[PDB]
Symmetry: C3
Subunit: 24 residues, 3 copies
């Protein structure tokens, strides 16, 4: 399913905006 | 449906993800 | 749906090494 593929990316990139912002 | 929206939200969230990581790498 | 399939593939490619590069930078 597509629902499961979206869920996997959602988990994968759960805190990357925050972590990049912290590195910055 | 719900799905299209969850996809759009991800597209927006990680819009600049890769370019900022690269800027961080370069600097 | 055919587009939704394509858009998901697009994000999987975009952020393929994303978490690994962040971890390394940290």
């Amino acid at each position: 399913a597509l629902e499961q593929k979206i869920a996997a990316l959602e988990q994968k990139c759960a805190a990357c905006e925050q972590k990049i912002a912290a590195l910055e």
